[PDB]
Amino acid sequence: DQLRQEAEQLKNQIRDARKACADATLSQITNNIDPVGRIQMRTRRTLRGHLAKIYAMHWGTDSRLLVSASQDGKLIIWDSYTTNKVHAIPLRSSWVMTCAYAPSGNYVACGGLDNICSIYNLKTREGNVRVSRELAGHTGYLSCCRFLDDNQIVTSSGDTTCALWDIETGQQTTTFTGHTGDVMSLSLAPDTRLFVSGACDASAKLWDVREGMCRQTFTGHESDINAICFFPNGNAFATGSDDATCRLFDLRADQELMTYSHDNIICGITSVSFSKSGRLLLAGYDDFNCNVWDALKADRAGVLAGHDNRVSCLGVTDDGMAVATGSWDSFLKIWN
Amino acid sequence: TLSAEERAALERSKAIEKNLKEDGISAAKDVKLLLLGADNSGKSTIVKQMKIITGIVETHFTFKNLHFRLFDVGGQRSERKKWIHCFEDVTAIIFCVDLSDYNRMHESLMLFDSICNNKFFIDTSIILFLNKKDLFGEKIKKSPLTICFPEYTGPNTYEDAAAYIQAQFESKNRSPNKEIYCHMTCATDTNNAQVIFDAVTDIIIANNLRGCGLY
């Protein structure tokens, strides 16, 4: 009972300190920057071959190779330039919710409702793709696998916790706890030393991969957070929730900078991605179309559209040349 | 596709696509059903021809040249709103209710109410199974059907009591284009597969009728 009072006063101290740092909103300082106009983006490629809903997609580090997981139980690696299929990996469980690509192109980790993160080796001497390691230890559905190196991966689950794994040994090196709801997404910072995870408790909190410490927590959303992605400089991140609102939080100021809500938007955000410059905030919505937000003025700088069903995944190449979108209509479209 | 190496890469892609289409053909002869219900309600012992295969449990019994795949979602112990949309394309929903449990009956009704009126399952027909007729028949004599349902007013006979429970479950439908196929089952019933088969065939006709434009 006494500690409960201590908990409350600590929140008041944080709120007062957080409010005292606020001097001017982001939309008030950059009011003199000229708008970026209309970003009209045209479909350049249409990747077909999936026979079920597409739930995840990750870009290769060379901005040419893609990976996509679907309910059909197939894992396809695409040549984004010539639209060819490089690999086709049959999964054990057809219920895959996330699917990641290694930064070196050697491995691919891709898992889902089976509570297991399966890692596949592409550069094998036998010419086929084999399941190198199956990571187990999560009691809930898996989401947002992210490779750190060729032998280190961070995973998120519905156990209200995320885990840091060692692919060689197979043991859970570090476990990050503190969420009070299913964790739906995570993103790795460019300096590969920090990451943020968005959970169902309407809160995203910054975690340290080396120490396993919740350095900071961020609030403001009214519903569960569905996606997250860092600003390109690794000093801010953007979240997407079922509240049909996008928000930009700053790690140094510990306060949200601006909101990306529009009166015509009803359905929540599914995916969040940034451009190479950090000016266009692309977000996928449940009303079958993606919107491009000017991340500095909260102005809709065009709409992608085109898809027939809910857009479930977004992806921007490392060089920023193209944007890949996946939806439940079993089609991947590449925009530019 | 100009270079010699790129010509073989295109040949590899076309060979991959052939197997992708072939696997899709073999994935159209199976019926995907969803198992739901409270614990200890017989949701794992409906058909004695199991041929099963913590998390998701599959069951792939076959009947009359048709493949039935049953997905048991129990044991996840997570928020259903985040992964129940994966089963948006299931043919039907199989719900199991235990008539001898007077305490979990209200718990079962909450489960049925949430699932039936879910936004993803607004058109998926439900095959509702009422289990353990004999156990319920003996239980009602010892304790009347009034502690669980204080609003009951009809005769204390088995026929009226069992039908009264059925009416409550169908009172939660509240939607068109959806039909609830009920059936009373016991422990020593072998024709559960036959009951599922005729309901699934009946559900397919309704969806085909809407697609053809007749209705």
Partner: single-chain antibody, 233 residues
């Protein structure tokens, strides 16, 4: 362990027919394209025929076009080469090579052990400057060969392959496009080039690097090898 073994060699009379079998054990044979390469006595390597994965696309060399035939038995993991009429030119050590083609693949990594066949009594021309180069260990060696056309495709890839045939062994792939090191080769090897002139450099040469070096083009069929540069110590 990847292993290709060939059998069916021997002494045959002119005008007869022989069949060579290449049984594979250690890799997914059904996904690889298999070539036949023959090496005449102390003359050099020469491409013969190629069958694609799934027996879709088949090619033959102009020398033995319409005379040889290649067949593929995927369930048995065996590759055949049936020769109808044999002259005195057919005598050579026939090798069996696997090849897989996709974005970023290595289509000439593994060569078979080779079988010896003895018989009793337009195209891209690649030329190697020299035939014998004496050198001592620790000294960098540069090997260069030219070509008729420009192997640099419009896609940005240059199709040049460098092989090393140690004495008494089978050729081993070192560089497969212009500078892409093969799997398991030492990092001291490096390659470069510009369109029609290419160079292979070996820094900090070791005693086991001696042998005959061949440069081959894969821009267009038929595949043509170089004259062959021999390193002496």
């Amino acid at each position: 362990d990847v292993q290709l073994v060939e059998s069916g060699g021997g002494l045959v009379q002119p005008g007869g027919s022989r069949k060579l079998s290449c049984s594979a054990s250690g890799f997914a044979f059904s996904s690889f394209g298999m070539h036949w390469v023959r090496q005449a006595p102390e003359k050099g390597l020469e491409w013969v025929a190629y069958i694609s994965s799934g027996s879709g696309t088949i090619y033959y060399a102009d020398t033995v076009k319409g005379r040889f035939t290649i067949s593929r038995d995927d369930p048995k993991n065996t590759l055949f080469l049936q020769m109808t009429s044999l002259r005195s030119e057919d005598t050579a050590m026939y090798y069996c090579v696997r090849s897989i083609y996709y974005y970023g693949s290595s289509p000439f990594d593994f060569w078979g052990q080779g079988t010896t066949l003895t018989v009793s009594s337009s195209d891209i021309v690649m030329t190697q400057a020299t035939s014998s180069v004496p050198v001592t260990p620790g000294e960098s060696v540069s090997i260069s060969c030219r070509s008729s056309k420009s192997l640099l495709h419009s896609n940005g890839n240059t199709y040049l392959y460098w092989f090393l045939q140690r004495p008494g062994q089978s050729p081993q792939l070192l560089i497969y496009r212009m500078s892409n090191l093969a799997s398991g080769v030492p990092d001291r090897f490096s390659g470069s080039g510009s369109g029609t002139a290419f160079t292979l450099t070996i820094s900090r040469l070791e005693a086991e690097d001696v042998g005959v070096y061949y440069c081959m083009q894969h821009l267009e069929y038929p595949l043509t090898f170089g004259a062959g540069t021999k390193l002496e110590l």
